[PDB]
Amino acid sequence: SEVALEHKKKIQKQLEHLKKLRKSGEEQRSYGEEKAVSFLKQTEALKQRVQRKLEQVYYFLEQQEHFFVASLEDVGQMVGQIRKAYDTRVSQDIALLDALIGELEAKECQSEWELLQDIGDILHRAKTVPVPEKWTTPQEIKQKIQLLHQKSEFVEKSTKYFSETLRSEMEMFNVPELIGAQAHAVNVILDAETAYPNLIFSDDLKSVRLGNKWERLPDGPQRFDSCIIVLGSPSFLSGRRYWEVEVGDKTAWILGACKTSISRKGNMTLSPENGYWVVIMMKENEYQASSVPPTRLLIKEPPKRVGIFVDYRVGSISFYNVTARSHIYTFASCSFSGPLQPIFSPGTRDGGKNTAPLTICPV
Amino acid sequence: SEVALEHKKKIQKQLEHLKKLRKSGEEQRSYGEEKAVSFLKQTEALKQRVQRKLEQVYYFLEQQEHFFVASLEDVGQMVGQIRKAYDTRVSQDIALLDALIGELEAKECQSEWELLQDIGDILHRAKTVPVPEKWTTPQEIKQKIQLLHQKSEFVEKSTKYFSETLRSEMEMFNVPELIGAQAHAVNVILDAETAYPNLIFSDDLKSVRLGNKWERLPDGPQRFDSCIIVLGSPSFLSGRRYWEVEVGDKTAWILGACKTSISRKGNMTLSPENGYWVVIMMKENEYQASSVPPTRLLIKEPPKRVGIFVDYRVGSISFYNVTARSHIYTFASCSFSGPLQPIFSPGTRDGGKNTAPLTICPVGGQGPDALEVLFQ
């Protein structure tokens, strides 16, 4: 019948369909397997890499502890022995003396006649008695102790450095990439009432450069007379804040953030303690962070544009190379709590090599 | 009687004597005690001092290991779940497909009447079966893994210098202080036949400086034409050897030791692989050792006199700042497979600023050793 033949036709068709789907299914199941294996292979490689390094550190430390502990036991042993032997010998000396004293005292309570007869050699023996042993510190104790001090010194230096790099890396782990920092962009302007008197400003207060000696803003108390500096608006009490500055081919500058209450007097250094968290460009290919002492930074691709990121939650301030989309430097967490604001210096003219302005730029 | 009185006098005298001795004895006994306990206390203080620091470090390391392993576990866990869940689901899809295929294959071999009865439902279900789930990698795996890389990098940046410092301090245990090395003084002269042609030498072969280009020694195959160097005599096959060089206020130079068989061609780097163990002064307050990559050295009190110490047994070569009586650098654990000799460079003239000679200088405690130029 027509309907049976037709149904057989459709059965064949559907069989083909189903078989193609099944084949796709197998390929897919297999590929999932391949990807899983590939993932675990990656993780295992990483695992083994970390495992070697830790194993190596632990080995050296076990060695260090072993030897130090042996050194302690050794010196302890020596000093114990010398102490005991000396105490015993000098006590033998005093005992001998005590007996001779006893004898002479015993000669008293004798009659003259008895005395002359029984005097014996006591006087000679008294006259020739050894002087009790003088304590003299042996060199062996002194060197073993000095070795211990040296190893202690090594330990303090090495563990200090380790503690510091570890903390550095620990803090580095939550610093955002550039786009994350950029999410918190704010609009910053220059507060010209704070400026060093020879600074010159664009009409939009986004740009600042250093003028010559006869180019002077009107004097006022709010100016930083003694530092080539200018502050930015707004201030910050909280949250995450970001801005960007075009530095171009300048040879010198200062960028970062400061406490709003920094002293306007010039006898203070730029440092966290005085309320500054900045990066300074000294000259071409010389950058340093204003840590104490300052940390020199090697930046493979010099920045044409620098990003500044304040994060109040963790109390950290980070710097980004916008040009190369890379991290420059982050100041230690819990540096600050009170209000902050941006700070700028376009540096000195450097003969004419550094006359270009700094420019605050929108993201 | 007179004799009795005398006996009594001598008796009293000796009592006073013995009493002074006893008192001194007591004082010394107690002072000895003090000095000893004082040592025991010092030791113990050192002990507690170190023990606290190490405990802290161990703690920090335990924390890093946990930090890393938590990610390892997290990654392993996610890949595990995604993998099993996906496999199980697609396997269900494929099995459903297999079942429908089974049904159809059974129907196509049934009698016509039997075939016609239930066919519509099976065919509908065949037509409408979903395509088996396609594998798509979740971002989460990619992320957790990248995080794991970040953490391994964390562990390495945190630990590297520290592990290297521990290794170095270990290697330093067989390196004497300066007088220990000076103990092995030997007398070295310059082998002028090996010298870069514009180099100039003293009569006694202890001094070498760089002359101008028109000052040329007679040319020969044995000279270093492409490098401003000269080698020293004698060579060493063994033992511990020490010598000293006055560098004074020079701004550039090379000092150290090399394999006698170094290439006389100038296309090789100064490096262990090429048979060089040297320290180079680049300019004022910049020194580096020819490790690979170079180890840059900052020296607080610059040397006017530099000591070189080869220890062939343990394969080390050490460098000393004689002026400050301090250590500059050590190549440790080197593979020495043959004779070594001294090597020198007076640097370039640098605009008249580095024109002064290097002078091999004897150490005070050595006999004269005349005349050594008869062994060269």
Side-chain angles (χ1 to χ4, degrees), chain A residues 1 13 84 120 195 225 247 264 302 309 326 328 334 347:
Chain A
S1 68
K13 181 188 176 183
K84 195 67 189 301
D225 289 320
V247 292
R264 311 299 195 238
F309 184 63
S326 67
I328 298 181
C334 301

PDB file of all heavy atoms in Angstrom, chain A residues 1 13 84 120 195 225 247 264 302 309 326 328 334 347:
ATOM      1  N   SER A   1       0.796  -1.193   0.000  1.00  0.00           N
ATOM      2  CA  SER A   1       0.000   0.000   0.000  1.00  0.00           C
ATOM      3  C   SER A   1       0.851   1.275   0.000  1.00  0.00           C
ATOM      4  O   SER A   1       1.985   1.362   0.517  1.00  0.00           O
ATOM      5  CB  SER A   1      -0.940   0.070   1.248  1.00  0.00           C
ATOM      6  OG  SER A   1      -0.127   0.236   2.423  1.00  0.00           O
ATOM      7  N   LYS A  13      14.413   8.364   5.733  1.00  0.00           N
ATOM      8  CA  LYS A  13      14.812   9.748   5.914  1.00  0.00           C
ATOM      9  C   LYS A  13      15.162  10.033   7.400  1.00  0.00           C
ATOM     10  O   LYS A  13      16.262  10.538   7.713  1.00  0.00           O
ATOM     11  CB  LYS A  13      13.705  10.677   5.420  1.00  0.00           C
ATOM     12  CG  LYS A  13      14.026  12.139   5.551  1.00  0.00           C
ATOM     13  CD  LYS A  13      12.829  13.002   5.232  1.00  0.00           C
ATOM     14  CE  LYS A  13      13.153  14.456   5.478  1.00  0.00           C
ATOM     15  NZ  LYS A  13      11.970  15.322   5.246  1.00  0.00           N
ATOM     16  N   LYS A  84      81.525  24.665  84.374  1.00  0.00           N
ATOM     17  CA  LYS A  84      81.652  23.622  85.389  1.00  0.00           C
ATOM     18  C   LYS A  84      83.080  23.311  85.809  1.00  0.00           C
ATOM     19  O   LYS A  84      83.380  23.273  87.012  1.00  0.00           O
ATOM     20  CB  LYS A  84      81.025  22.319  84.895  1.00  0.00           C
ATOM     21  CG  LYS A  84      80.795  21.292  85.992  1.00  0.00           C
ATOM     22  CD  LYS A  84      79.749  21.694  87.023  1.00  0.00           C
ATOM     23  CE  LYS A  84      79.753  20.703  88.186  1.00  0.00           C
ATOM     24  NZ  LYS A  84      79.466  19.296  87.774  1.00  0.00           N
ATOM     25  N   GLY A 120     105.959  21.723 111.956  1.00  0.00           N
ATOM     26  CA  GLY A 120     106.088  21.054 110.667  1.00  0.00           C
ATOM     27  C   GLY A 120     106.373  21.993 109.503  1.00  0.00           C
ATOM     28  O   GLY A 120     106.972  23.041 109.688  1.00  0.00           O
ATOM     29  N   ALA A 195      48.597  77.386  43.508  1.00  0.00           N
ATOM     30  CA  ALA A 195      49.758  77.176  42.668  1.00  0.00           C
ATOM     31  C   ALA A 195      51.031  77.963  43.078  1.00  0.00           C
ATOM     32  O   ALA A 195      50.981  79.116  43.532  1.00  0.00           O
ATOM     33  CB  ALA A 195      49.393  77.513  41.237  1.00  0.00           C
ATOM     34  N   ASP A 225      54.662  78.631  48.005  1.00  0.00           N
ATOM     35  CA  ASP A 225      55.810  79.445  47.599  1.00  0.00           C
ATOM     36  C   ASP A 225      57.082  78.642  47.396  1.00  0.00           C
ATOM     37  O   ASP A 225      57.897  78.986  46.561  1.00  0.00           O
ATOM     38  CB  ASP A 225      56.078  80.518  48.634  1.00  0.00           C
ATOM     39  CG  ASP A 225      55.029  81.583  48.634  1.00  0.00           C
ATOM     40  OD1 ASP A 225      54.574  81.972  47.533  1.00  0.00           O
ATOM     41  OD2 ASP A 225      54.641  82.007  49.743  1.00  0.00           O
ATOM     42  N   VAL A 247      51.454  63.643  29.746  1.00  0.00           N
ATOM     43  CA  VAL A 247      52.805  64.138  30.053  1.00  0.00           C
ATOM     44  C   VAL A 247      53.658  64.282  28.812  1.00  0.00           C
ATOM     45  O   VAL A 247      54.682  64.960  28.848  1.00  0.00           O
ATOM     46  CB  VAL A 247      53.586  63.209  31.039  1.00  0.00           C
ATOM     47  CG1 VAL A 247      52.957  63.219  32.440  1.00  0.00           C
ATOM     48  CG2 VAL A 247      53.720  61.781  30.505  1.00  0.00           C
ATOM     49  N   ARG A 264      52.254  74.093  53.757  1.00  0.00           N
ATOM     50  CA  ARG A 264      52.595  74.964  52.645  1.00  0.00           C
ATOM     51  C   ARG A 264      54.052  75.437  52.779  1.00  0.00           C
ATOM     52  O   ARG A 264      54.578  76.118  51.892  1.00  0.00           O
ATOM     53  CB  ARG A 264      51.629  76.153  52.564  1.00  0.00           C
ATOM     54  CG  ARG A 264      50.122  75.781  52.634  1.00  0.00           C
ATOM     55  CD  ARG A 264      49.659  74.861  51.491  1.00  0.00           C
ATOM     56  NE  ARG A 264      48.197  74.777  51.336  1.00  0.00           N
ATOM     57  CZ  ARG A 264      47.440  73.672  51.396  1.00  0.00           C
ATOM     58  NH1 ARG A 264      47.946  72.475  51.643  1.00  0.00           N
ATOM     59  NH2 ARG A 264      46.136  73.779  51.209  1.00  0.00           N
ATOM     60  N   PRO A 302      58.096  54.219  27.955  1.00  0.00           N
ATOM     61  CA  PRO A 302      57.801  55.404  28.768  1.00  0.00           C
ATOM     62  C   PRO A 302      56.379  55.938  28.549  1.00  0.00           C
ATOM     63  O   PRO A 302      55.881  55.904  27.429  1.00  0.00           O
ATOM     64  CB  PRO A 302      58.828  56.431  28.292  1.00  0.00           C
ATOM     65  CG  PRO A 302      59.836  55.663  27.527  1.00  0.00           C
ATOM     66  CD  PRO A 302      59.131  54.490  26.952  1.00  0.00           C
ATOM     67  N   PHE A 309      45.068  56.363  40.464  1.00  0.00           N
ATOM     68  CA  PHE A 309      43.950  55.646  41.059  1.00  0.00           C
ATOM     69  C   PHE A 309      44.003  55.572  42.581  1.00  0.00           C
ATOM     70  O   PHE A 309      44.817  54.839  43.139  1.00  0.00           O
ATOM     71  CB  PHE A 309      43.914  54.229  40.515  1.00  0.00           C
ATOM     72  CG  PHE A 309      42.736  53.415  40.984  1.00  0.00           C
ATOM     73  CD1 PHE A 309      41.436  53.797  40.653  1.00  0.00           C
ATOM     74  CD2 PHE A 309      42.920  52.222  41.665  1.00  0.00           C
ATOM     75  CE1 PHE A 309      40.349  53.036  41.035  1.00  0.00           C
ATOM     76  CE2 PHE A 309      41.823  51.442  42.046  1.00  0.00           C
ATOM     77  CZ  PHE A 309      40.540  51.851  41.720  1.00  0.00           C
ATOM     78  N   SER A 326      49.642  49.398  31.303  1.00  0.00           N
ATOM     79  CA  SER A 326      50.426  48.593  32.217  1.00  0.00           C
ATOM     80  C   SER A 326      50.515  49.256  33.574  1.00  0.00           C
ATOM     81  O   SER A 326      50.342  50.478  33.707  1.00  0.00           O
ATOM     82  CB  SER A 326      51.832  48.385  31.650  1.00  0.00           C
ATOM     83  OG  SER A 326      52.526  49.626  31.615  1.00  0.00           O
ATOM     84  N   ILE A 328      52.386  50.765  36.790  1.00  0.00           N
ATOM     85  CA  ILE A 328      53.611  51.460  37.139  1.00  0.00           C
ATOM     86  C   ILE A 328      54.016  51.228  38.606  1.00  0.00           C
ATOM     87  O   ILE A 328      55.116  50.757  38.893  1.00  0.00           O
ATOM     88  CB  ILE A 328      53.486  52.966  36.942  1.00  0.00           C
ATOM     89  CG1 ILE A 328      53.221  53.276  35.480  1.00  0.00           C
ATOM     90  CG2 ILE A 328      54.803  53.666  37.438  1.00  0.00           C
ATOM     91  CD1 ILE A 328      53.109  54.768  35.189  1.00  0.00           C
ATOM     92  N   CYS A 334      46.801  50.951  53.550  1.00  0.00           N
ATOM     93  CA  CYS A 334      46.592  51.583  54.852  1.00  0.00           C
ATOM     94  C   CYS A 334      47.602  52.708  55.023  1.00  0.00           C
ATOM     95  O   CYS A 334      48.064  53.005  56.126  1.00  0.00           O
ATOM     96  CB  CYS A 334      46.656  50.566  55.999  1.00  0.00           C
ATOM     97  SG  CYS A 334      45.445  49.196  55.897  1.00  0.00           S
ATOM     98  N   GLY A 347      57.403  70.212  36.653  1.00  0.00           N
ATOM     99  CA  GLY A 347      58.852  70.222  36.707  1.00  0.00           C
ATOM    100  C   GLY A 347      59.478  71.535  36.289  1.00  0.00           C
ATOM    101  O   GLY A 347      58.784  72.487  35.922  1.00  0.00           O
TER     102      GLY A 347
END
